[PDB]
Design a protein around this ligand. Structure first.
Ligand SMILES: CCOCCOCCOCCCCCCCCCCC=O
Ligand SMILES: [Fe+3]
Ligand SMILES: [Fe+3]
Length: 221
């Protein structure tokens, strides 16, 4: 059944969830602009994708305002800190495949799963915004997916290392927010299932086989 969107219990859990989604969108904008320094020939497409995230950030900001909820931005900044730190380290080292696996694959699959799970349990205002985010988010092949498919043979080992370091951070992020997600009527198992399917699909597209993907998904533990 649908949660009571007016209760203090819902508003409290929404304050952290909403803030995480808002921060995720801001960091996605910053990340695609940062990737532009590593891929100067991709600047215009990256600027277009960065503008999409700011549109989503504004949409999700309005979701919190509509419910009369103040987003806990400090919690959101700390929530993203381990993953943000690893992105910055890869960026400074000029590690384009790592930067792309973090933002274009892991964060996008994390967002897709979250949005798909939230839609059937969301309030009418937030439902239209979220459905609008999914039915617009991107093209057939993502700036990262397509890039990683084209450059796989030169970056296979870096991708396996990036997955090993960053996939457990995504797992820990979900564990940290599973309680608040449950208040919003979202099942943790539905979030895990959807994320793994979306991540498996992108890896298959890039060029990894069943055995390689199995080994990669196993890095989460
Ligand atoms: C391996 C287990 O990990 C599964 C993670 O499932 C996803 C759970 O996410 C629920 C928290 C909601 C946060 C959404 C993040 C929004 C980020 C938007 C950035 C856009 O590019
Ligand atoms: Fe987004
Ligand atoms: Fe995105």
């Amino acid at each position: 059944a649908l949660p009571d969107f007016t209760s203090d219990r819902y508003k409290d859990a929404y304050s952290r969830i909403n803030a995480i989604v808002i921060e995720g969108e801001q960091e996605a904008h910053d990340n695609y602009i940062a990737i532009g320094t590593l891929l100067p020939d991709h600047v215009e497409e990256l600027k277009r994708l960065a503008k999409m995230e700011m549109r989503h950030k504004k949409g999700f900001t309005a979701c919190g305002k509509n419910l009369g909820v103040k987003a806990d931005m400090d919690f959101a900044r700390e929530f993203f800190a381990p993953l943000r730190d690893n992105f910055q380290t890869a960026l400074g080292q000029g590690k384009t495949p790592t930067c792309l696996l973090i933002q274009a694959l892991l964060i996008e699959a994390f967002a897709i799963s979250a949005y798909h799970t939230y839609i059937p349990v969301s309030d009418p205002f937030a439902r239209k915004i979220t459905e609008g985010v999914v039915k617009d988010e991107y093209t057939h092949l993502n700036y990262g997916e397509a890039w990683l498919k084209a450059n796989l043979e030169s970056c296979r080992e870096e991708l396996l290392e990036a997955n090993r370091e960053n996939l457990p951070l995504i797992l820990r992020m979900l564990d940290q927010v599973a309680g608040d997600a449950a208040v919003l009527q979202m099942d943790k198992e539905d979030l895990i299932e959807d994320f793994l399917i979306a991540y498996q699909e992108s890896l298959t597209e890039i060029g990894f086989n069943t055995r390689e993907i199995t080994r990669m998904a196993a890095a989460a533990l």
